[PDB]
Amino acid sequence: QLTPTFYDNSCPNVSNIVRDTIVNELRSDPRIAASILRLHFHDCFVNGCDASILLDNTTSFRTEKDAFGNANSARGFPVIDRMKAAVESACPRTVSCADLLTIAAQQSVTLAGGPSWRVPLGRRDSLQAFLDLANANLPAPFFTLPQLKDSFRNVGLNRSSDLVALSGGHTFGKNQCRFIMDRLYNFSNTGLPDPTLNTTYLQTLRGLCPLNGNLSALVDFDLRTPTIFDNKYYVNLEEQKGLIQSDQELFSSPNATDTIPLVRSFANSTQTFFNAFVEAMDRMGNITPLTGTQGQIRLNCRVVNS
Ligand code: HEM
Ligand SMILES: [Ca+2]
Ligand SMILES: [Ca+2]
């Protein structure tokens, strides 16, 4: 069983070291908090939160960093290396990379103005990476609501609240033009933009992402508060201003009978959202963890111990 007090004796200063690292990095890179939260999400959705995503290539297995959902998208790996080194210095061979990334995600959320809570700990590090599993398990922005629900249920999160609350991670961070080009100019081969995208916002997005333009250009997930972790993400959905297809579907999909009330509830109350986010975050962080003597306490998050 994972417990929040796992390192209270072996490394009581772990959370503080992680926090300090993120604060320092945020000065030069204001996007790092969002990036780190996403790393934890992509870790947990592939064989569980076992730091498998942090492993680099080996001749026996490919890195998950080359998965379609990670390649030229996932970022912040050096920052994780930095805090790991700092933690290793303070508490040698004690904190697993899986736990380190979980704490980093929570601290990132709190630093961005979100809720503060102690995450369950005790996770251990994987002995391999899973590229094929990452390609199969990570959801895509073009997924329909039924597909989004399928993706979450596939890894163990059955509740619509899990999906709606965790999607709130898009209250900050960036998104490449490539992922919304269809919504802007030719959605589902209709030759027309996605009708669920507010027409005024459509104009703004087309200006940021012109046809035949730089597909790698970045746009903010939350037009209201781009870098602040708050419930504004849901207010946007209510106005048909969700950035990617998977965001807006939570409110506009024909299959959204169960998700619409959740979107409204979170848009109406920061407290309701924050409570649900913490609840969902801990549930995601409890996905098939290696514990006890299973796996290792990786010393270098990029490679398995030898
Ligand atoms: C429900 C399905 C989800 C889909 C399809 C999805 C899709 C995406 C896409 C397309 C990007 C843009 C990547 C890029 O342009 O490089 C992204 C970024 C991001 N996602 Fe999601 N996401 C989902 C769920 C989540 C969840 C559960 C969290 C965390 C709780 C999360 C947190 C983030 C963050 C913070 C970013 C910004 C990262 C950065 O700016 O570096 N996402 N997501
Ligand atoms: Ca993993
Ligand atoms: Ca926000």
Token output for 166? 């965790």
CA of 171 to the centre of ligand 3 (A): 4
Nearest Cα residue to 241 out of 267, 270, 227, 221: 221
At how many degrees (to 10) do helices 260-268 and 270-284 cross? 120
Separation between Cα atoms, residue 269 and residue 109, nearest integer Å: 18
Residue 300 sits at φ, ψ, to 5 deg, of -120, 110
- Which residues does a 6 A CB cutoff place in the pocket of ligand 1? 31, 34-35, 37-38, 41, 73, 75, 139-141, 143, 148, 166-167, 169-170, 173-176, 179, 244, 246
Asked if residue 230 lies in contact with residue 171, where contact means CB atoms within 8 angstroms, the answer is: yes
The yes-or-no answer on residue 42 being catalytic is yes
Nearest Cα residue to 79 out of 22, 4, 139, 136: 22
Probe ligand 1: pick from 49, 53, 170, max atoms within 8 Å of CB?
Answer: 170
CA of 96 to the centre of ligand 3 (A): 30
Looking at the DSSP assignment, which residues form a beta bridge with residue 220?
174
- List Cα–Cα distances, 22 to 31, 53, 111, 242, 274, in angstroms: 11, 19, 8, 28, 21
Ligand-binding annotation for 252, yes or no, is no
Give the Cα-Cα-Cα angle 72, 37, 102 (nearest 5 degrees): 120
Residue nearest (by alpha carbon) to ligand 1 atom 14? 175
- List Cα–Cα distances, 201 to 99, 184, 192, in angstroms: 39, 10, 15
CB atoms near residue 150 (< 10 Å): 12
CA of 290 to the centre of ligand 2 (A): 10
Residue nearest (by alpha carbon) to ligand 1 atom 36? 173
Owner of token pair 């990670």: 70
Listed in sequence order, the DSSP H helices in 186-300 are 199-208, 232-238, 245-252, 260-268, 270-284
Residue 98 sits at φ, ψ, to 5 deg, of -60, -45
Which domains are present in the chain? 2-138+285-305 (1.10.520.10), 139-284 (1.10.420.10)
Residue nearest (by alpha carbon) to ligand 1 atom 39? 35
Helices then strands, counting H and E runs in the chain, come out as 13, 2
Residue 78 sits at φ, ψ, to 5 deg, of -65, -35
Token output for 92? 């040698």
Burial class (CB in 10 A: 0-12, 13-18, 19+), 166: buried
Resolution (Å) of this entry: 1.6
Separation between Cα atoms, residue 264 and residue 231, nearest integer Å: 10
Separation between Cα atoms, residue 14 and residue 5, nearest integer Å: 11
Give the Cα-Cα-Cα angle 180, 183, 185 (nearest 5 degrees): 105
Ligand that lies nearest to the alpha carbon of residue 34, given by its number in the listed order: 1
Catalytic residue among 31, 38, 40, 42: 42
Asked if residue 80 lies in contact with residue 100, where contact means CB atoms within 8 angstroms, the answer is: yes
Ligand-binding annotation for 230, yes or no, is yes
Give the amino acid at 150. D
